[PDB]
Amino acid sequence: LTYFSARKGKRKTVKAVIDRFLRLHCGLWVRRKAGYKKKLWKKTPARKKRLREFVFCNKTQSKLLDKMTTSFWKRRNWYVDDPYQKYHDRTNLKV
Template sequence: MLNTLKISFFQIRTKIHFSITDGKPITNFEVVSRYFRLNNGLWIHAKPKRRSRVWKKTEFSNISRHEHVFTSEEKCIMLDKLVDKEWKERRHFINDEYSEYHKWDNLPKYKYLKKVDKFYP
């Protein structure tokens, strides 16, 4: 019997590039330019389409388009794979705008936690 290949039409961005000289993984600089990694392991990014059709949007959406959004658990793991060890280290900035978000308080703690099945009695 012939084995049929399963073709996936979904985008998969888990390709890790390696340097020719060292053989170490290279950072994907598109990730670094679009996302910001917090010290607790979460990633944030700006809202999509925040610059398009501003004249058409309401006043509330124009105000809220400057806000940042947390990424999901799966996306955090994927972005950590695409980034080098250098970008995962803690960074200390003077007058950091995100200093309140670097802590674990009142944030979801899903950094690489094993998924536990729900217990049904």
């Protein structure tokens, strides 16, 4: 994944991860379901409703994506009207 670049000696990031996933500052990664816009004419409304969901990733997948991205994508952002602003923090979680 180019741990060391030939120009700066820096770690690089896989841009497919950035194009496909969103990282909340707590450490959670959000993805879209596969096939959520393919052949909707053979799918039931419940299946399509569960396909339209934004879902969380595994612990293993989260660590893999953290390895595949650089620390720039893990900083705390303060956008103006972020629809995911309230999801960047964890509440009432115990160990």
